[PDB]
Amino acid sequence: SITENTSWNKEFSAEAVNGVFVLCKSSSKSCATNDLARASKEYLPASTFKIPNAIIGLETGVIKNEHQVFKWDGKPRAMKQWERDLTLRGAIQVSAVPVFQQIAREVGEVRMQKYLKKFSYGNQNISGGIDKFWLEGQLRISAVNQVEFLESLYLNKLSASKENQLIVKEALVTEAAPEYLVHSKTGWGMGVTPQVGWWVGWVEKETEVYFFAFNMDIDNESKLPLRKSIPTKIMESEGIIGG
Amino acid sequence: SITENTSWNKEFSAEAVNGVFVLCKSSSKSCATNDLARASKEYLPASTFKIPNAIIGLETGVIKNEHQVFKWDGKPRAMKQWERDLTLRGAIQVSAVPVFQQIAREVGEVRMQKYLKKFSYGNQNISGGIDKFWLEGQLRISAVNQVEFLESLYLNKLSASKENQLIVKEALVTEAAPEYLVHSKTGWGMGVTPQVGWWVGWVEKETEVYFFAFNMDIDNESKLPLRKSIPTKIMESEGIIG
Ligand SMILES: *C(=O)[C@@H]([C@@H]1N=C(C(=O)O)[C@@H](S[C@@H]2CN[C@H](C(=O)N(C)C)C2)[C@@H]1C)[C@@H](C)O
Numbered sequence: 425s426i427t428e429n430t431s432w433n434k435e436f437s438a439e440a441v442n443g444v445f446v447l448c449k450s451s452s453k454s455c456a457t458n459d460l461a462r463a464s465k466e467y468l469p470a471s472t473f474k475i476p477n478a479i480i481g482l483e484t485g486v487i488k489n490e491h492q493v494f495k496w497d498g499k500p501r502a503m504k505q506w507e508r509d510l511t512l513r514g515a516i517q518v519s520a521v522p523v524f525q526q527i528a529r530e531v532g533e534v535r536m537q538k539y540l541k542k543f544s545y546g547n548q549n550i551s552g553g554i555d556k557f558w559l560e561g562q563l564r565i566s567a568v569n570q571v572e573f574l575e576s577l578y579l580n581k582l583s584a585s586k587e588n589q590l591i592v593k594e595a596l597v598t599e600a601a602p603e604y605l606v607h608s609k610t611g612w613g614m615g616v617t618p619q620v621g622w623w624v625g626w627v628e629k630e631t632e633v634y635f636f637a638f639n640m641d642i643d644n645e646s647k648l649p650l651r652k653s654i655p656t657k658i659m660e661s662e663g664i665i666g667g
Numbered sequence: 668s669i670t671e672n673t674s675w676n677k678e679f680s681a682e683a684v685n686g687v688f689v690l691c692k693s694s695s696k697s698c699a700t701n702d703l704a705r706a707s708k709e710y711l712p713a714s715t716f717k718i719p720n721a722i723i724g725l726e727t728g729v730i731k732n733e734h735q736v737f738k739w740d741g742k743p744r745a746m747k748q749w750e751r752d753l754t755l756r757g758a759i760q761v762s763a764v765p766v767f768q769q770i771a772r773e774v775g776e777v778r779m780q781k782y783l784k785k786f787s788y789g790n791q792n793i794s795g796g797i798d799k800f801w802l803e804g805q806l807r808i809s810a811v812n813q814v815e816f817l818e819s820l821y822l823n824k825l826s827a828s829k830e831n832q833l834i835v836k837e838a839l840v841t842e843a844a845p846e847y848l849v850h851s852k853t854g855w856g857m858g859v860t861p862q863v864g865w866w867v868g869w870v871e872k873e874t875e876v877y878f879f880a881f882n883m884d885i886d887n888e889s890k891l892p893l894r895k896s897i898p899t900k901i902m903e904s905e906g907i908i909g
């Protein structure tokens with residue numbers, strides 16, 4: 425149920441990219457990858473962890489509803505993009521880590537641990553501090569596991585209410601056309617070596633659905649756009665993205 | 668306390684059309700329009716009815732859940748874009764009336780009437796045949812009432828499950844950026860005279876929300892793009908777009 429698509433490393437060679445793409449039609453029982461070994465290798469989730477963190481935040485009541493506004497207290501934040509009040513969708517889409525760090529502290533270790541067990545989320549290792557484990561701690565997850573987790577979310581089959589799964593799904597829409605709809609989330613983990621870049625999500629086109637996860641080593645910061653463009657080119661070539 | 672902004676009319680006269688835009692910031696208690704009278708006048712909803720129809724289809728269980736596929740039976744349809752299997756978002760986004768006429772049939776008049784009452788939807792008149800009333804029947808709704816209805820949907824305050832309100836909201840997304848999200852639906856009602864063009868929806872911009880509803884008299888298909896361009900120009904003047 426996972427096959428190595430040699431037809432794909434051609435897209436990684438031009439930019440000298442060490443990375444993996446996993447692409448599954450309908451279910452995680454029909455996947456292909458450019459690299460079987462790397463597909464199952466676990467990497468720091470970085471900002472992709474905002475997807476389970478948001479679901480857990482809602483399930484525990486730490487996050488009130490999709491209308492909650494996370495107010496900026498005026499204190500300097502690492503990125504200018506974070507120095508403003510944010511909705512839940514805004515916090516996710518601009519990757520506002522201080523909002524999610526506060527959410528993780530309020531969830532707490534015991535509940536965080538349990539929910540990552542219920543979600544089968546990577547190595548389920550939350551060592552390194554309740555507000556740091558997905559940034560520079562021990563949590564690790566593979567591209568295959570990402571696509572299993574997102575398929576569950578799409579189907580409302582995670583161990584969470586359908587309502588809370590639906591709230592997080594709308595928060596992840598990144599491209600909307602009358603032809604197709606994309607839900608997705610990037611990551612850049614600078615707290616590990618090599619640094620890791622992610623783009624994960626799913627595409628609904630016509631009456632089909634494709635789940636994907638991409639990660640790569642980030643050799644330098646100017647390579648960051650490849651985390652979306654390489655998988656985008658692959659999916660465009662297969663007809664998955666595009667009208 | 669809806670306010671009249673007469674300067675907005677320049678956008679209609681620039682394009683030789685008659686119509687109304689209603690725009691509200693935060694809630695339906697802070698609204699402005701170019702034409703106070705027309706803002707409250709009721710017009711056939713046409714394809715904008717797919718919003719309540721979708722919600723009612725899910726509430727009644729006619730639509731199983733968000734992943735329902737509406738299979739095309741091979742019989743010819745009025746638009747080639749409807750001759751295919753469609754998801755709920757697909758059917759809404761291409762305005763596939765045959766899908767919604769089958770939903771309305773299965774819902775039935777008694778349940779359709781009950782929900783339009785709960786939703787305070789226009790004159791709630793579903794005379795005209797169960798699969799025709801919003802296309803050539805007696806149903807009529809104003810721009811103000813569309814904004815009130817969509818405000819209730821945004822807030823999950825319609826008389827339907829939160830889940831089903833969320834499902835239809837995702838089906839209505841038409842533009843997405845990290846801090847800017849648009850949910851919207853067009854309409855063209857040619858089963859009435861004059862014909863009516865609509866665009867209704869709401870914009871979530873940073874932490875603010877703006878609800879809107881636009882309609883205009885349509886001679887024919889050629890003026891349909893104005894349903895988006897006139898609202899876009901007014902909302903730009905209000906600082907919402909850029
Ligand atoms: C997540 O993995 C980490 C964050 N992801 C980043 C990235 O993808 O560049 C940055 S935050 C960045 C601020 N400008 C961007 C934006 O506003 N949009 C793309 C909408 C995102 C950061 C390193 C971290 C939070 O773990």
Ligand SMILES: *C(=O)[C@@H]([C@@H]1N=C(C(=O)O)[C@@H](S[C@@H]2CN[C@H](C(=O)N(C)C)C2)[C@@H]1C)[C@@H](C)O
Nearest residue numbers: 602713714715748760761762764853854855
């Ligand atoms: C609804 O008001 C009516 C429909 N609205 C139409 C319109 O706005 O032109 C047409 S269907 C139209 C065909 N192409 C459009 C589209 O976005 N795609 C093909 C992607 C949809 C129709 C008269 C009616 C169904 O009530």
